[PDB]
Amino acid sequence: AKPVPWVEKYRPKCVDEVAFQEEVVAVLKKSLEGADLPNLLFYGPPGTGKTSTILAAARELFGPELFRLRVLELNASDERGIQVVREKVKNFAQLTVSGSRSDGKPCPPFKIVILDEADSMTSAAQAALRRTMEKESKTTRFCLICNYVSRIIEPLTSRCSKFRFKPLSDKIQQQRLLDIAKKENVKISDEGIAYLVKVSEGDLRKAITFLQSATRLTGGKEITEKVITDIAGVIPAEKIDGVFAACQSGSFDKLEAVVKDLIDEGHAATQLVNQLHDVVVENNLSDKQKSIITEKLAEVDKCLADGADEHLQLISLCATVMQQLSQNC
Amino acid sequence: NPVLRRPPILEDYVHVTSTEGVRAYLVLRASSHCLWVDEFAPRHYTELLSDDFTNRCLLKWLKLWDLVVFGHERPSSHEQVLEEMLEAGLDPSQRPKQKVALLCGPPGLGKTTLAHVIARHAGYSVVEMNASDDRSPEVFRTRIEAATQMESVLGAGGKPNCLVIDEIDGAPVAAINVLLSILNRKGLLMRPIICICNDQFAPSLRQLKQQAFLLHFPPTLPSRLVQRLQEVSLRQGMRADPGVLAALCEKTDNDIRACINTLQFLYSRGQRELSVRDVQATRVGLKDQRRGLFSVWQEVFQLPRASLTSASQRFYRVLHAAASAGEHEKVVQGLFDNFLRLRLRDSSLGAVCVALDWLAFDDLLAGAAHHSQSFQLLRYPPFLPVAFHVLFASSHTPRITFPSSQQEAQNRMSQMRNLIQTLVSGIAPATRSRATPQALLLDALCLLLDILAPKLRPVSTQLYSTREKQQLASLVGTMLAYSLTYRQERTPDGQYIYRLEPNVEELCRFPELPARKPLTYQTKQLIAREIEVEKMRRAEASARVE
Amino acid sequence: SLWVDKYRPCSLGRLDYHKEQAAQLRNLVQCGDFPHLLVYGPSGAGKKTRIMCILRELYGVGVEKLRIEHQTITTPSKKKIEISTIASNYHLEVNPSDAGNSDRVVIQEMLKTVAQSQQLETNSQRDFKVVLLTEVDKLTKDAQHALRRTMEKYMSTCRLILCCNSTSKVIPPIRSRCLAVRVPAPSIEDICHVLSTVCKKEGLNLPSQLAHRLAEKSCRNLRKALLMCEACRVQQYPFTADQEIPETDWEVYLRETANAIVSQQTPQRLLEVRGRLYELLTHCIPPEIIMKGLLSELLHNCDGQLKGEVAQMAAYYEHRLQLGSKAIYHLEAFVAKFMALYKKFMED
Amino acid sequence: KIRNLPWVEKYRPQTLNDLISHQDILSTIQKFINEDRLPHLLLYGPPGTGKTSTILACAKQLYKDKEFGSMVLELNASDDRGIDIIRGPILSFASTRTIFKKGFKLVILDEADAMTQDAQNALRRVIEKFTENTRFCLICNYLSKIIPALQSRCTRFRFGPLTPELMVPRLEHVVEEEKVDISEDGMKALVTLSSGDMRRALNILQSTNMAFGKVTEETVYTCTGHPLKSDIANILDWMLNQDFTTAYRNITELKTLKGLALHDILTEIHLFVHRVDFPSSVRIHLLTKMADIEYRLSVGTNEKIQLSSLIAAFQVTRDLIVAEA
Amino acid sequence: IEPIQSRCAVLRYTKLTDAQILTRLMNVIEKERVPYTDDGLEAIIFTAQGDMRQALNNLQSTFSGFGFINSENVFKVCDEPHPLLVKEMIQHCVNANIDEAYKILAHLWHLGYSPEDIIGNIFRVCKTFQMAEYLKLEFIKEIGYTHMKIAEGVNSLLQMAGLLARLCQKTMAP
DNA sequence: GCAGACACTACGAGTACATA
Ligand SMILES: Nc1ncnc2c1ncn2[C@@H]1O[C@H](COP(=O)(O)OP(=O)(O)OP(O)(O)=S)[C@@H](O)[C@H]1O
Ligand SMILES: Nc1ncnc2c1ncn2[C@@H]1O[C@H](COP(=O)(O)OP(=O)(O)OP(O)(O)=S)[C@@H](O)[C@H]1O
Ligand SMILES: Nc1ncnc2c1ncn2[C@@H]1O[C@H](COP(=O)(O)OP(=O)(O)OP(O)(O)=S)[C@@H](O)[C@H]1O
Numbered sequence A: 001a002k003p004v005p006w007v008e009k010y011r012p013k014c015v016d017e018v019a020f021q022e023e024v025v026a027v028l029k030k031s032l033e034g035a036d037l038p039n040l041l042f043y044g045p046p047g048t049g050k051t052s053t054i055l056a057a058a059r060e061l062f063g064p065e066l067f068r069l070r071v072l073e074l075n076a077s078d079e080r081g082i083q084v085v086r087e088k089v090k091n092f093a094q095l096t097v098s099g100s101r102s103d104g105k106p107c108p109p110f111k112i113v114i115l116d117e118a119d120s121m122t123s124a125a126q127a128a129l130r131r132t133m134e135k136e137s138k139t140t141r142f143c144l145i146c147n148y149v150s151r152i153i154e155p156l157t158s159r160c161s162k163f164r165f166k167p168l169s170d171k172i173q174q175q176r177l178l179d180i181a182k183k184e185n186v187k188i189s190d191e192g193i194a195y196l197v198k199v200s201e202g203d204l205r206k207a208i209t210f211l212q213s214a215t216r217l218t219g220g221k222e223i224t225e226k227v228i229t230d231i232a233g234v235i236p237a238e239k240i241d242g243v244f245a246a247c248q249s250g251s252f253d254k255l256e257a258v259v260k261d262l263i264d265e266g267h268a269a270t271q272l273v274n275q276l277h278d279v280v281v282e283n284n285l286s287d288k289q290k291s292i293i294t295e296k297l298a299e300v301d302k303c304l305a306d307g308a309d310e311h312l313q314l315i316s317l318c319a320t321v322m323q324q325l326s327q328n329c
Numbered sequence B: 001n002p003v004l005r006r007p008p009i010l011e012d013y014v015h016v017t018s019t020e021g022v023r024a025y026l027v028l029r030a031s032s033h034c035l036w037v038d039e040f041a042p043r044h045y046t047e048l049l050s051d052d053f054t055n056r057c058l059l060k061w062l063k064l065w066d067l068v069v070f071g072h073e074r075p076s077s078h079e080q081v082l083e084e085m086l087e088a089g090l091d092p093s094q095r096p097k098q099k100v101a102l103l104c105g106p107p108g109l110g111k112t113t114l115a116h117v118i119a120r121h122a123g124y125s126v127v128e129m130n131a132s133d134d135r136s137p138e139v140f141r142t143r144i145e146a147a148t149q150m151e152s153v154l155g156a157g158g159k160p161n162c163l164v165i166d167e168i169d170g171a172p173v174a175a176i177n178v179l180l181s182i183l184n185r186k187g188l189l190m191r192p193i194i195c196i197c198n199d200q201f202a203p204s205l206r207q208l209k210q211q212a213f214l215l216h217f218p219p220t221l222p223s224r225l226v227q228r229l230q231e232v233s234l235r236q237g238m239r240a241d242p243g244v245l246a247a248l249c250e251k252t253d254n255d256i257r258a259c260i261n262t263l264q265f266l267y268s269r270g271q272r273e274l275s276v277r278d279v280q281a282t283r284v285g286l287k288d289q290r291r292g293l294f295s296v297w298q299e300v301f302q303l304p305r306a307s308l309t310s311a312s313q314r315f316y317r318v319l320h321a322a323a324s325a326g327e328h329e330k331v332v333q334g335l336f337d338n339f340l341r342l343r344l345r346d347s348s349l350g351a352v353c354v355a356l357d358w359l360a361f362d363d364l365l366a367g368a369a370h371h372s373q374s375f376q377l378l379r380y381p382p383f384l385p386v387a388f389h390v391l392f393a394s395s396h397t398p399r400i401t402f403p404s405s406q407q408e409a410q411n412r413m414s415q416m417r418n419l420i421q422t423l424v425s426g427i428a429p430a431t432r433s434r435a436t437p438q439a440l441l442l443d444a445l446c447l448l449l450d451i452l453a454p455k456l457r458p459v460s461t462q463l464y465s466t467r468e469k470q471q472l473a474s475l476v477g478t479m480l481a482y483s484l485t486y487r488q489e490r491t492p493d494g495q496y497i498y499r500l501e502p503n504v505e506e507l508c509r510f511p512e513l514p515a516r517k518p519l520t521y522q523t524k525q526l527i528a529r530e531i532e533v534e535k536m537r538r539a540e541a542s543a544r545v546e
Numbered sequence C: 001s002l003w004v005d006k007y008r009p010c011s012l013g014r015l016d017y018h019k020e021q022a023a024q025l026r027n028l029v030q031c032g033d034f035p036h037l038l039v040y041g042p043s044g045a046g047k048k049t050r051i052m053c054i055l056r057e058l059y060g061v062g063v064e065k066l067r068i069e070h071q072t073i074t075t076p077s078k079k080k081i082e083i084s085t086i087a088s089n090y091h092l093e094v095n096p097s098d099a100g101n102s103d104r105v106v107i108q109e110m111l112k113t114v115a116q117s118q119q120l121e122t123n124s125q126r127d128f129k130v131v132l133l134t135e136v137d138k139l140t141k142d143a144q145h146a147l148r149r150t151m152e153k154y155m156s157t158c159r160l161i162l163c164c165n166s167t168s169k170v171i172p173p174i175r176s177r178c179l180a181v182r183v184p185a186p187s188i189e190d191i192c193h194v195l196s197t198v199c200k201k202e203g204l205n206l207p208s209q210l211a212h213r214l215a216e217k218s219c220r221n222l223r224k225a226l227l228m229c230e231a232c233r234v235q236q237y238p239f240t241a242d243q244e245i246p247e248t249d250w251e252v253y254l255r256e257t258a259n260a261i262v263s264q265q266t267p268q269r270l271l272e273v274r275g276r277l278y279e280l281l282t283h284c285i286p287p288e289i290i291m292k293g294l295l296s297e298l299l300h301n302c303d304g305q306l307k308g309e310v311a312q313m314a315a316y317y318e319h320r321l322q323l324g325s326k327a328i329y330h331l332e333a334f335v336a337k338f339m340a341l342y343k344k345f346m347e348d
Numbered sequence D: 001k002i003r004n005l006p007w008v009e010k011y012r013p014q015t016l017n018d019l020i021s022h023q024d025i026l027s028t029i030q031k032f033i034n035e036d037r038l039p040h041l042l043l044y045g046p047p048g049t050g051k052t053s054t055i056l057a058c059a060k061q062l063y064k065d066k067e068f069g070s071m072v073l074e075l076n077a078s079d080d081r082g083i084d085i086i087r088g089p090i091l092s093f094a095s096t097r098t099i100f101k102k103g104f105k106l107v108i109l110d111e112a113d114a115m116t117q118d119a120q121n122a123l124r125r126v127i128e129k130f131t132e133n134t135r136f137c138l139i140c141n142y143l144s145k146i147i148p149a150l151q152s153r154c155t156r157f158r159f160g161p162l163t164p165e166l167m168v169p170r171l172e173h174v175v176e177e178e179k180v181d182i183s184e185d186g187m188k189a190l191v192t193l194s195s196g197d198m199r200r201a202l203n204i205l206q207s208t209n210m211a212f213g214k215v216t217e218e219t220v221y222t223c224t225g226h227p228l229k230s231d232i233a234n235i236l237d238w239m240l241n242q243d244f245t246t247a248y249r250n251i252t253e254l255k256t257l258k259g260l261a262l263h264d265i266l267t268e269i270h271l272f273v274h275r276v277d278f279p280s281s282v283r284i285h286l287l288t289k290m291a292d293i294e295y296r297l298s299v300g301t302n303e304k305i306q307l308s309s310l311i312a313a314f315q316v317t318r319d320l321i322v323a324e325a
Numbered sequence E: 001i002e003p004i005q006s007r008c009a010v011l012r013y014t015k016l017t018d019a020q021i022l023t024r025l026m027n028v029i030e031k032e033r034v035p036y037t038d039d040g041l042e043a044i045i046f047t048a049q050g051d052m053r054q055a056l057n058n059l060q061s062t063f064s065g066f067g068f069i070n071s072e073n074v075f076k077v078c079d080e081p082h083p084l085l086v087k088e089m090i091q092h093c094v095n096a097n098i099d100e101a102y103k104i105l106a107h108l109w110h111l112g113y114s115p116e117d118i119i120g121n122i123f124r125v126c127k128t129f130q131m132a133e134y135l136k137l138e139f140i141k142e143i144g145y146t147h148m149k150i151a152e153g154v155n156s157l158l159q160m161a162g163l164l165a166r167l168c169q170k171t172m173a174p
Numbered sequence F: 001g002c003a004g005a006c007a008c009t010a011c012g013a014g015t016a017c018a019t020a
């Protein structure tokens, strides 16, 4: 009777528990009925449900007794070189489908190879997979899971039926979070759940983690909007107004001061980029100023994506929008 | 005009509107049994074609070996070092201080020919070692021990054995180690050994150059080469004027073997008179030449002296020779270390900025080729030396030095990382987890060294104050917590100093900083003495507690 | 023992600053089903103190009895690499960035052996173990992509507390899997209160002005502030208001390097500055801190219509430095571009 | 009998008549087979065009089922194809005779671009010396990964992309044999979203038949997730007609309602820019900007900021286009 | 290596002249009795590009597939050489003409050429193109910068059009 | 019959490089 965190406790065990990915869920449901399951490719933003859908599907198709004999799951946490693809994947794909389910539920006549996080596979190791799927598809199936389809080579993209996992809508995420909160004997206000589905941005794992952490922080009382704001790392609006006041001042000393304030208070630059962009696209600036400020925001977000330093990127973006605000002064 | 004020009548249109609210419209729709190199090969000393000095030096080096081998007292800049070392005397073993001779140079001059001619001239019998042997260390050892450590089987009148080792640069490191092991047996070496190589700067021949009679081969003079080619052509009964022979000499790079083979192909028996257009054609006799690093840097940084004045020809020549040199990383390091020492005419530093952009582009390409396993990106970093040639083309004479800043920086960085790993491992694990080595280096070292060195008077502990005793005990505790101590060290000037066992002052101090007052010998000795007696007292306290 | 380690708090209720966050972390880990944590903030804020306080709250007092453990891991190139590890009877701490680019091997082999093994004693030790991955911002992208399934499969048995400085260097697959805990730097008043409490616990007297100057000179780093407070105690026991605070050698060396940049803009001065940057890089200073100190000092000597271009130039060349592999190329490119811009500004 | 196979492998052109597009190349290959003069082939092109199926139909036509193991040595990238294999099993297969029936052999080397340069250099004299006894077929997607000696030794047939006019009747045959209800716009959407690739056309058809049961333009563009041409035209109209906040609100509302991705939006906008009569400088600036945005989406970046930059790339040039007049 | 080349008379062969291919084409045609026209044999020579193996292979393929050598019978099974269009498209990129350069790029894209082959022939054409040296160097740097993005995984028509637009930008940015 | 000597192949290990 050990405690289990809510991201694994509420992990879909069946295909009907997956939310908002309607087309692929219907595809696997017809495959559950007995239709011809093709080779699958799952790609999209994190937290959308790529791993859980195929794991619940394989549990549905094979049951508990046939998961070890029909499913080979490979991730980036183990070694996937050219030799692992050439030996281990090929020997598994050349195996026989033997063993039926003992509960009377139908058993599919194929195996499933789950290559989760297939961006990390090399281009040479992906090239060795092609005729493995072309030749041994009578007795096995392949499911590649990734986040960026550009990291998958075009033969492997062409061989697999691509399903894009969309970011979750506000409505479906709201009902799923409300159902999880109802099942856990906890309460949350309308503004709190609205701010939760605004913060999570289609990430159900992040939403469940924030809901569980707010439940543990409050202890079981009302989960209001303020615990959501201080649990998400959301920068307060006064800091953004101070940043824009320092930008409209036209002096680099106050700009450095507020950038050092935001760096020293532990605020992430991704959250500052998001909130800054939300302020710029919703004010009375000119179209040219908004255009090059948003272009600088895109290039700063890209430079933060390759792990550059926070302070220098923030001082460059703040210098650019300072120049844009002080050009018309 | 692509933009129409009036809307199109038949074609589809896409609207475009400015911020001032006006509209514009676009459009949506045995003479014949031998080679000539072997027929015209030198058999005597007087028909050699090398530099005369090198011949005198090799002959005089072999003629002084007579005292130990033949048992006879009488035999019958780079210039000054070789002339001094020949008359340098003998060590107490009646044998030369240089036990092998290393013959270095480009291919096609006669190093093997001079070695064989000198060995057969001095009464020796030539024993040939080549790259066609096995060259394993055991095989190398038994073959040198067979060639050099016994006399002739014929007895009296038998010629002594001269070991000639062609292509020593292709031998492995352990073969050179075996050769140096048999060189320095104090089973003494009683026979001369001649080693022939094509590149002295190989990593396997570093130690050999500190022990050998270093003979450097200059390229052959064109006058003697043209006269020898004239003798070769006249002995075959055919005519070639010396202009086309000089053109062949300049084309084949002062090579006797390449020029004689090219003359053998171009003559045949159909015609007797060689044409200039046949030699000036590139279809025969042209070989790719492995250019040196210094020649590549000289051709990049210096313009050719004044056709050949076209810039595209210089572009292609610099690119082709920099690609043909090989060792691209060393060329990049030399261009990085030599492009700031020139008389640069770009005072606005635009050329320096775009040269650093090109170097960062090369580095990004190397990282992308070694990261994504896509090695087809390595066709562009050959264009880095031609970019440096385009940017820094000058008519001056630059002094190009060998690159060493990146290598010494990497060595020094590895040394300080080893020192950091030494410092961290001595720290107790209760306080190791509380700070990373990066934060301990950036924050907790120089201030820690300021803690460890206060103002202390040269006064014994019996005359110290109670505050002094508390300060001294606290400092000894801070020394013992970080596992630091002082030890004795020796200096060549003759005095004793104290220094830390992890020498963390190099991790802390910087060369251009202003100086600070260090602790004295009395203070440092007294601190080390309290470190030892505090270790003894802590052992006594551990025995008393347990 | 120095002042940074002698007066570290043990429990969550003993922390003088961020007490509301201490109560929130007390309520977070009480049940034991708390998710993976991403403790992030500026360096010297007190992240490791809060992590060890969480470990004290979860298990007994046996998390303070540590030991050095060594493990040799085999690379795919069959070259053995030794990695050090702080371990306890309840938790373990790994720094995979000591292995260089072979941190992916450490994640793939070392972490799975810890995560796939259930704990030997289930009554004294709790139902889960904690792995401390320290400095995950320096991890390569391959190691972070190898990390994620270990944080999903064996989560209910092997919990993780990731510690870093910047969450921008953490990939969003990892950032989605863990609850981010923000630890900001303490302000001037909290650092002054901590320094005054430390000095009063040692029997000393510390003035408010000296503590304020120690707080501003440390740039909101409590470790650095306590270190210069101990150094100021060592050099002069009477704590005057205008007592000189000692400084680290690499910071003043960076200041003199930037002064040499400002003083002359010539290719041989560029060569001398490159030698100074080689001296800074060989002392294991990270290149982004060299760039930050350079921008911190070179902007003092710039005029008001030049600081934005220098800041954008520094950020651009820092991003190119993080994309590349050799630091000296991008550092010297930034310095040369600054000399060109400074010469164009002064000559016009 | 019914089989559990994907439709890209259940419906494979076992004969040369079942392939659709490259009629002249296949007629020449059939005349090579019928006259017993088949040379060393080099089949290259984009993926999904039918290069593996062509040589499998050739091997099935040349050799019967009772002697297929003695004549075809098929090696692809899944098998180890080092220089030991070229100097070993491949050379021994090429230099020996046949066990059962007298005839010429065939060595099929699928994914010949993935072979090393040492194996490709060792393959030259095996091809040249034993050309009477065996023939070598190299199938690749990238011709730059094959050394020019192997390109000289083998006559090359460019298996280009499948045009949608001849790609329709094969899809009609698959539809008729699979009992699938499909409209005209559904087939148009299949041959448009496939883009010269019959593998992903069958994958889209199978996925849409499983997801919806019917194949219409709405069902295909919903299952694939691609934006329709009218919505891309609306996005271009919003980016070229209105101000920043209103166009941002419209495009964000469309992307939230439809669940669109920025990669397909960038691809279709890049296709619509070259059709729109832009000035040269405006087109150059737009192409550079969309190249920067599409490069930026390959990492862990925020898609909203890139969408704002995509709007910004047209709001910059609106004033330039209008003042151009 | 250089010592082996010094031991020989290193003969160097040049690419075959069209008349030299044409004489052996006469030889093979009269021993094989191949009906032909002149323009088809110029098409065979154009497809061969100094390669006699390619000339014989294309002649045998055209004779086996159609039985007669005209221009459109040759071009039905053979192909026009790729870098001859890349030279004209690089020339269009030199005069900052993005429309014709994109027309040639889209024609090569619809023929089924992978981005790796296109960018490799772009680099080979720009290696020996006749322009300024600094313009060629920044062109080669831009080609390598685009080839990095091709190698990491993103390879579409948009990246190639962006490379063409950046090459057109390099001319207008002195 | 069993101990010693011979060559035999499989396997471990170190090193280089990958482009036009
Ligand atoms: N569609 C969904 N329906 C229900 N729960 C979901 C859904 N998506 C995510 N979750 C929850 O979030 C957890 C994580 O989902 P995952 O499937 O691992 O996300 P993901 O697609 O794997 O993201 P990446 O790409 O691996 S970082 C699951 O265990 C569920 O608890
Ligand atoms: N004076 C000469 N006249 C004519 N031919 C000569 C003369 N001297 C040497 N040769 C020939 O030129 C060649 C000399 O080169 P070798 O001594 O054999 O080798 P090497 O010069 O040491 O260069 P490498 O590095 O071994 S290729 C031989 O083929 C000789 O026969
Ligand atoms: N010309 C064609 N005619 C009919 N069906 C085709 C054609 N080309 C492809 N297909 C279908 O697509 C499937 C895959 O074709 P393949 O021959 O494997 O493609 P490919 O030419 O091998 O491409 P790559 O480079 O190997 S990924 C076949 O099984 C057919 O169902």
Ligand SMILES: Nc1ncnc2c1ncn2[C@@H]1O[C@H](COP(=O)(O)OP(=O)(O)O)[C@@H](O)[C@H]1O
Pocket (backbone or CB within 6 Å): B434, B435, B439, C003, C004, C005, C007, C008, C009, C014, C015, C016, C017, C042, C043, C044, C045, C046, C047, C048, C049, C050, C194, C222, C223
């Ligand atoms: N609440 C606190 N009270 C007293 N001292 C603290 C407190 N928090 C941190 N410190 C001190 O400040 C320093 C901060 O270092 P650490 O706790 O490792 O955080 P970081 O990992 O961010 O450097 C520690 O040496 C610790 O002794």
Ligand SMILES: [Mg+2]
Pocket (backbone or CB within 6 Å): A050, A051, A116, A117, A145
């Ligand atoms: Mg996953």
Ligand SMILES: [Mg+2]
Pocket (backbone or CB within 6 Å): B111, B112, B166, B167, B196
């Ligand atoms: Mg020789």
Ligand SMILES: [Mg+2]
Pocket (backbone or CB within 6 Å): D051, D052, D053, D110
């Ligand atoms: Mg295929």
